[PDB]
Amino acid sequence: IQTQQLHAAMADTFLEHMCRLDIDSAPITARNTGIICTIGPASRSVETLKEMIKSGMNVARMNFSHGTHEYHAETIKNVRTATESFASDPILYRPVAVALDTKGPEIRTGLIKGSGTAEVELKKGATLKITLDNAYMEKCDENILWLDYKNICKVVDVGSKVYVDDGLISLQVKQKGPDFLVTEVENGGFLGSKKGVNLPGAAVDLPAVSEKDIQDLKFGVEQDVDMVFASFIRKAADVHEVRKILGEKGKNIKIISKIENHEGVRRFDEILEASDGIMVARGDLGIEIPAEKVFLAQKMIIGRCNRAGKPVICATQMLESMIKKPRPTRAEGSDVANAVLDGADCIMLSGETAKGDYPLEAVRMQHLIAREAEAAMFHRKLFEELARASSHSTDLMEAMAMGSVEASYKCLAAALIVLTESGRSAHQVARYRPRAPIIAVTRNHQTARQAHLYRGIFPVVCKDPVQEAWAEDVDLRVNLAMNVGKARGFFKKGDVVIVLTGWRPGSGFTNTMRVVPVP
Amino acid sequence: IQTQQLHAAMADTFLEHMCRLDIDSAPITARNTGIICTIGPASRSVETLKEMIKSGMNVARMNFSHGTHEYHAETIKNVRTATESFASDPILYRPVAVALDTKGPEIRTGAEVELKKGATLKITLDNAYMEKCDENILWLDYKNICKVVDVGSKVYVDDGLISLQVKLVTEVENGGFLGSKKGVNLPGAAVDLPAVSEKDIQDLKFGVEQDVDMVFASFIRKAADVHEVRKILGEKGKNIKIISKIENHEGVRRFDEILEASDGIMVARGDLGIEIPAEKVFLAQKMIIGRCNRAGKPVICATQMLESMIKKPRPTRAEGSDVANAVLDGADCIMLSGETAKGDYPLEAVRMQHLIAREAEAAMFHRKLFEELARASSHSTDLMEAMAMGSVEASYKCLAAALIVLTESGRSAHQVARYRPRAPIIAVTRNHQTARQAHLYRGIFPVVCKDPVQEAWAEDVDLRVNLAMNVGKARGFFKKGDVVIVLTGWRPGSGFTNTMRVVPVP
Amino acid sequence: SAFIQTQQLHAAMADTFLEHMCRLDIDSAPITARNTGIICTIGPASRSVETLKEMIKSGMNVARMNFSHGTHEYHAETIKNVRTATESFASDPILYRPVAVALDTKGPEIRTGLIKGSGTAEVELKKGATLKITLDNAYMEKCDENILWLDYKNICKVVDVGSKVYVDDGLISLQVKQKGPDFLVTEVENGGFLGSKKGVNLPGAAVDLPAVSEKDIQDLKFGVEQDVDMVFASFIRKAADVHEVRKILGEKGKNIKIISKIENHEGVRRFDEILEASDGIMVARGDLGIEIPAEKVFLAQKMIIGRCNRAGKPVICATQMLESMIKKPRPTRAEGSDVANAVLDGADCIMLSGETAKGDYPLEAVRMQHLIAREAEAAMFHRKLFEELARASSHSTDLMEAMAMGSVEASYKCLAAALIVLTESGRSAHQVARYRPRAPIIAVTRNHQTARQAHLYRGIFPVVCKDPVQEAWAEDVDLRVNLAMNVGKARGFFKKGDVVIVLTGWRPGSGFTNTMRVVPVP
Numbered sequence A: 001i002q003t004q005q006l007h008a009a010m011a012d013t014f015l016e017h018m019c020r021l022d023i024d025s026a027p028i029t030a031r032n033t034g035i036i037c038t039i040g041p042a043s044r045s046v047e048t049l050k051e052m053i054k055s056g057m058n059v060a061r062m063n064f065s066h067g068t069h070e071y072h073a074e075t076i077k078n079v080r081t082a083t084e085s086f087a088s089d090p091i092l093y094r095p096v097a098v099a100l101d102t103k104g105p106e107i108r109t110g111l112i113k114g115s116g117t118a119e120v121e122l123k124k125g126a127t128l129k130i131t132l133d134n135a136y137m138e139k140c141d142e143n144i145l146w147l148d149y150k151n152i153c154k155v156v157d158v159g160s161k162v163y164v165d166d167g168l169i170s171l172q173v174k175q176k177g178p179d180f181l182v183t184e185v186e187n188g189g190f191l192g193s194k195k196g197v198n199l200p201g202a203a204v205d206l207p208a209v210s211e212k213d214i215q216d217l218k219f220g221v222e223q224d225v226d227m228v229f230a231s232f233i234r235k236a237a238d239v240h241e242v243r244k245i246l247g248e249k250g251k252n253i254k255i256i257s258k259i260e261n262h263e264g265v266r267r268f269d270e271i272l273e274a275s276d277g278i279m280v281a282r283g284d285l286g287i288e289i290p291a292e293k294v295f296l297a298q299k300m301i302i303g304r305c306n307r308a309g310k311p312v313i314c315a316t317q318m319l320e321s322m323i324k325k326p327r328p329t330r331a332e333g334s335d336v337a338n339a340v341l342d343g344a345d346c347i348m349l350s351g352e353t354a355k356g357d358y359p360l361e362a363v364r365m366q367h368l369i370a371r372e373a374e375a376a377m378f379h380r381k382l383f384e385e386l387a388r389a390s391s392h393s394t395d396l397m398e399a400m401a402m403g404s405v406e407a408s409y410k411c412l413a414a415a416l417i418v419l420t421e422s423g424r425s426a427h428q429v430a431r432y433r434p435r436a437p438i439i440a441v442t443r444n445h446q447t448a449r450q451a452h453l454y455r456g457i458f459p460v461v462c463k464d465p466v467q468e469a470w471a472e473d474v475d476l477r478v479n480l481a482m483n484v485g486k487a488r489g490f491f492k493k494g495d496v497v498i499v500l501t502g503w504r505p506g507s508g509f510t511n512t513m514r515v516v517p518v519p
Numbered sequence B: 001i002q003t004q005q006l007h008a009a010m011a012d013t014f015l016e017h018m019c020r021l022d023i024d025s026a027p028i029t030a031r032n033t034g035i036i037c038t039i040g041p042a043s044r045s046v047e048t049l050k051e052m053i054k055s056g057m058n059v060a061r062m063n064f065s066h067g068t069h070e071y072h073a074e075t076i077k078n079v080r081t082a083t084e085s086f087a088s089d090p091i092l093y094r095p096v097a098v099a100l101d102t103k104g105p106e107i108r109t110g111a112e113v114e115l116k117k118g119a120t121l122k123i124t125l126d127n128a129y130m131e132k133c134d135e136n137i138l139w140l141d142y143k144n145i146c147k148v149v150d151v152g153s154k155v156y157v158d159d160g161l162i163s164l165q166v167k168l169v170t171e172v173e174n175g176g177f178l179g180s181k182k183g184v185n186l187p188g189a190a191v192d193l194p195a196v197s198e199k200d201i202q203d204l205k206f207g208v209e210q211d212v213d214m215v216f217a218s219f220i221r222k223a224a225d226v227h228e229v230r231k232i233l234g235e236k237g238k239n240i241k242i243i244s245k246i247e248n249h250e251g252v253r254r255f256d257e258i259l260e261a262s263d264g265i266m267v268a269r270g271d272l273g274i275e276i277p278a279e280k281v282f283l284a285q286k287m288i289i290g291r292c293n294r295a296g297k298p299v300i301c302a303t304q305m306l307e308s309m310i311k312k313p314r315p316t317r318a319e320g321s322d323v324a325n326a327v328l329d330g331a332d333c334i335m336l337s338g339e340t341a342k343g344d345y346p347l348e349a350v351r352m353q354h355l356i357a358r359e360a361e362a363a364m365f366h367r368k369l370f371e372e373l374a375r376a377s378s379h380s381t382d383l384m385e386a387m388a389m390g391s392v393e394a395s396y397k398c399l400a401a402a403l404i405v406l407t408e409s410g411r412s413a414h415q416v417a418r419y420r421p422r423a424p425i426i427a428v429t430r431n432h433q434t435a436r437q438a439h440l441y442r443g444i445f446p447v448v449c450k451d452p453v454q455e456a457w458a459e460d461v462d463l464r465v466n467l468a469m470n471v472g473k474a475r476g477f478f479k480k481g482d483v484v485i486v487l488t489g490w491r492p493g494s495g496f497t498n499t500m501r502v503v504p505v506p
Numbered sequence C: 001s002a003f004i005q006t007q008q009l010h011a012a013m014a015d016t017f018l019e020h021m022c023r024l025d026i027d028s029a030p031i032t033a034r035n036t037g038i039i040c041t042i043g044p045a046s047r048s049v050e051t052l053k054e055m056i057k058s059g060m061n062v063a064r065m066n067f068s069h070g071t072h073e074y075h076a077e078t079i080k081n082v083r084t085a086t087e088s089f090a091s092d093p094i095l096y097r098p099v100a101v102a103l104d105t106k107g108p109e110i111r112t113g114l115i116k117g118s119g120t121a122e123v124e125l126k127k128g129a130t131l132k133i134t135l136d137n138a139y140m141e142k143c144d145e146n147i148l149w150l151d152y153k154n155i156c157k158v159v160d161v162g163s164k165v166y167v168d169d170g171l172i173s174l175q176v177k178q179k180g181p182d183f184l185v186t187e188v189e190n191g192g193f194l195g196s197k198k199g200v201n202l203p204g205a206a207v208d209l210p211a212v213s214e215k216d217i218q219d220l221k222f223g224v225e226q227d228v229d230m231v232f233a234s235f236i237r238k239a240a241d242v243h244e245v246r247k248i249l250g251e252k253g254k255n256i257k258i259i260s261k262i263e264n265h266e267g268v269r270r271f272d273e274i275l276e277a278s279d280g281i282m283v284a285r286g287d288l289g290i291e292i293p294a295e296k297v298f299l300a301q302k303m304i305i306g307r308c309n310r311a312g313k314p315v316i317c318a319t320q321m322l323e324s325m326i327k328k329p330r331p332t333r334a335e336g337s338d339v340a341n342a343v344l345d346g347a348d349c350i351m352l353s354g355e356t357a358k359g360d361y362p363l364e365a366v367r368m369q370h371l372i373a374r375e376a377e378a379a380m381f382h383r384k385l386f387e388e389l390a391r392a393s394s395h396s397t398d399l400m401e402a403m404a405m406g407s408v409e410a411s412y413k414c415l416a417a418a419l420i421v422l423t424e425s426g427r428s429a430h431q432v433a434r435y436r437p438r439a440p441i442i443a444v445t446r447n448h449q450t451a452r453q454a455h456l457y458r459g460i461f462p463v464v465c466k467d468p469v470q471e472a473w474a475e476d477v478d479l480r481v482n483l484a485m486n487v488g489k490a491r492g493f494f495k496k497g498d499v500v501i502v503l504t505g506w507r508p509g510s511g512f513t514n515t516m517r518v519v520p521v522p
Ligand SMILES: Nc1ncnc2c1ncn2[C@@H]1O[C@H](COP(=O)(O)OP(=O)(O)O)[C@@H](O)[C@H]1O
Pocket: A038, A039, A040, A041, A063, A065, A066, A067, A116, A117, A192, A193, A194, A195, A196, A283, A350, A351, A354, A355
């Protein structure tokens, strides 16, 4: 039996491709889909983070809708301490990116019983009072719930629904007062701290960038984060404001715009143009729009990102049941697989790693599913259709990238080795979707961390001095990639790899492609 | 904004089709994917069943893994009572099918105990421990177990929630709260239990007496297992559809011979994802649905599709995408198990499957699907496939609001459904069982004709076509002056729908 | 019998265009029916009644009367002979073939004057010499190697310095070096002997000659009196030219088909508006290859045929298809290839000019077109072609298209031997032909002109019904279907127990064939 679904790869039609998928065709060792993990109470110790990294985490997401600056600064330091504990073996060291996820124009509840991790059970049919009175900001419980949108009474009426925590709990407004709402719990569930609140259709008036957003973005720059996940982006102008806040000092921080309401979907094209990448933020998106339409938004957005070559993240509830169970549901296995098949560069865990009982198992499960689904992609058709979509561009690096991926298909190469400093050369390869892993070797450590945003880029940090002869410096870096792929089991001596390098030090892209045997 | 994802429908590539998907393009009213609901404590009252029918339930599944014949007979009676309460109005009456899901060669065990990781547990076949099960000695009813498990292999208990490794003397690899009569899987074991036990024969014969429409047969491993079920159902049960459940490695490996012998297939993902690595289930699901689509045989996607709605009135984001992707994959029907059998929100679960299916149905890439289906069957020159293809082709070209099919065996309508129009297929039949079994097929909206046969063939055809016209208007599938494709027999003995017309709605 | 190779059906099953080509099989036998219409220019070699009887038996569907030469009396007699020869077969309604009459107009022309006053004198033009073109009528009988008069008074408004002027069917070519108000100083690029009263071509110019000459206006009215079926309209450059021809034909000629001849750069550039206004197109490769560089003609041919195929409007490939058969009983290998590639390109009809008007082998030329066309028709890649035609027309939701697409699709799936189409205007059968079944389309009609005009469409085999209308509609439909059944059996298109697709109207008033049946041949 051909490994890597290579019998399905040769199919002529999509139907035949599907009919050839074979549970006994082994996937390869390399896993191309980036894994992004929300770090919080369950996952922020140095010891757990070491195991997260070993289980496959590539990006640590800090959610600034929770915690304080000091809380997230300590989480981040632990991420970097854990990451650097593997630096004593540069062949095995994995770069780990740090992402800051913004509050944005959102509504949040307060602290249950003065704690960011406390919860209470709401009973169906019980009464629950919402108050605006800051005396209760840190004193929420099963009777009294505070939230931070001072104008809420002007946008809801008796009979309105108030949804808490991505639609988990629905509250029906029964009475209104000057700074309170008396509601009835329409369905039971557990209410925790600082939960999002959605009032779908209602005219919530909040700025693209709040004063708290400005302080969090500035903290991101101070902390040297690699990327910002900008919540509730609704138009290109919002991205521009975020980029302005990040300023000259933060000019290389990637802005990933989160699509999570109707307007972000309807203005998607201008948002993508202005952003460095996209998150399909299904948590909010699936209570802001009809839940049966989210999959339409997801495949549209992933496809248009693939077309532009810009990273796209699929997020939220992918393995939700694993918050409490050590194995996922069948719908959850299917969801991760299909997001990889849709074309997502990265997949993400939220509660599964931030607060659940099985954070390592959730990471490990995303790793296993992603590898299976990567082999089950229909690469030959995908490449043809991406090439068609980009054909107005005659860009030279795109040409090198398409030529290299094409060669990698024909000779079934075990990897593409790319030498890159800004990352661009490796990004353009990733965009044309080889099945083999892309080992990107860079002396730019931030380039290495940000590469996790792209399907199939396995970044490697070169810490050696720059050799006097350009040809020897190229070889030193190619040989580093060679030793990494051997150590990771991506290939062995005598396999064939594609190697992308710059011809001269002054080439500003990898204009040189070789097929070489592994030494 | 064109409705029904029609902009995406005209794309040239799959990538472009996805990039054109539009949350503001409204789906049509008709919903083509059959909805199968397991009936249990939460849903077996006559009053709840009526709402299940209103909410979109097409097939009532009785799970014989549990409950007595008396229990299930009463469930079936209530299903029929709720169904017939709508028979007053023949224009609005929905036929509802009854399916019997066999127990099969299950392995079960004999309050609560706790098994903890690393603890050593002994698996006894000594019947004295049949009811003396604790965290040290566990009794299971598979008495050939020790001949089929090697040392070191894994033993899975309780829906896969616990794991053990044979050192039977075993070590708990990951433990939990252990109960009575819990499911047990031996993946990578060549389980020799018979596909049909004496209990299964009792249940199958009971299904024949209860006039069920279809059997979902558990743990089918080979064509011979299907043949044995067919044998048991016998001559009296000969028109009962056999749906083979694929739920272990051998069933996947031998899938082609199983499909050949079966009337249809269930992807039984619950057990399947215990028997094989859970990360491989989607490969099996897509392979099986695709191969059923090629053959034109019904395929059901099953298990945990909306699992969280057992306790919550709205589903997770993964559950939404799972239902949608099963429809895009090609499943004829989707199923609910605990969500309707015992959960807190059975009506909402049914309604959510209805809502997601309609959206996903519009998002199918019909032009390419048709081409590829036509390609895969091109060695066949069958006349009714030719009528079906020409009719679906015509329905794409003029954006017909429906295909009306007069059928008595259902065969003409099944061949239309196999080529996957986007418009609903209103199948008018006088054969009540044909009407109920048609729910197994994507897009067939069965309509039972109770009128006597007219002396004049032309007039009897007109009577049945006008009944479909009235149904479709009442249900909002079309209105006067829309266009429909109508498929009939030219003469009483024609043998299939050899006549196709484009007809305006009156 | 799955091992018997017929109709290139193994190549039909290929997945790619390359694999389809790799599967073409000289030992895969074609069917009897030949779908590409054959248009023959009638002339001194083919004009007699007895020769025309043999032309019809060899495969002629359309007789082309070329009004560039001959008087009205001459053409009346040719037309008369065509109808005598056609009707001599009318005693067997099962075998009778309708035969259309086409009028091909002379059209507007540009001509030079007399060399030294003499119809027979010539001068040598030398490459690099200077030659002045003048409009001064003083020189119209005094042309020579220094002064050439021509009769197109607006020539200086439509050409410029650097423009080419071609003389005598492209024999001589001239480059404008200087332009005055009523003269052109040219240099000879390609020399030759220049005679009297020769044709002139202006490559790339927007020639503003009228759409029809005064001779054309009289010829067109004559054609209405002669009851011609179609007009091949010369030198069509824009939609306005088509409308003018339509105006002249007027109310009495409103059912005559107008086929626009594309002959020069402007007509290719404005093709889309010409197509919309026309009933069909002729790729007039002779004059087109004078007007545009000959190595570009195949581009225009494949473009025009493709765009006609997309619209469902008839297209003719014309000129020098079997040229060497003017003098030889067998064609060259390039000629066999040319005919076959025109059919693969999508042409509804192919045409003979000199080969039938004046050559030594008119019957052999007709027979060879029939043979090649049958072979190339099976070698089409119908599955891909139908998919691409359906894609191109998908903005139309037209009901008759839907029936035609469904009917052709069914005919592919069950390898039907024919489609039977009952039609009065032709429209229902035209829509079926548009979607390119491999099986012949037997179109039964009571309208004799519909039957003759149907030859413009690939695959339509028209059949005239002469039986009185039956009072019961079902009986009248059955009568016509059974006639198609007897025609197809007599011609060997099918035999008892083969399957055919049958397109009829459900009721007398249905307006198109809204009813499709798969039917066994009785
Ligand atoms: N930094 C944190 N501190 C405490 N709890 C957190 C933190 N990050 C996440 N969580 C918990 O995990 C849940 C899911 O994580 P996430 O999806 O990032 O949050 P949300 O959906 O609330 O924006 C949160 O609602 C919160 O209960």
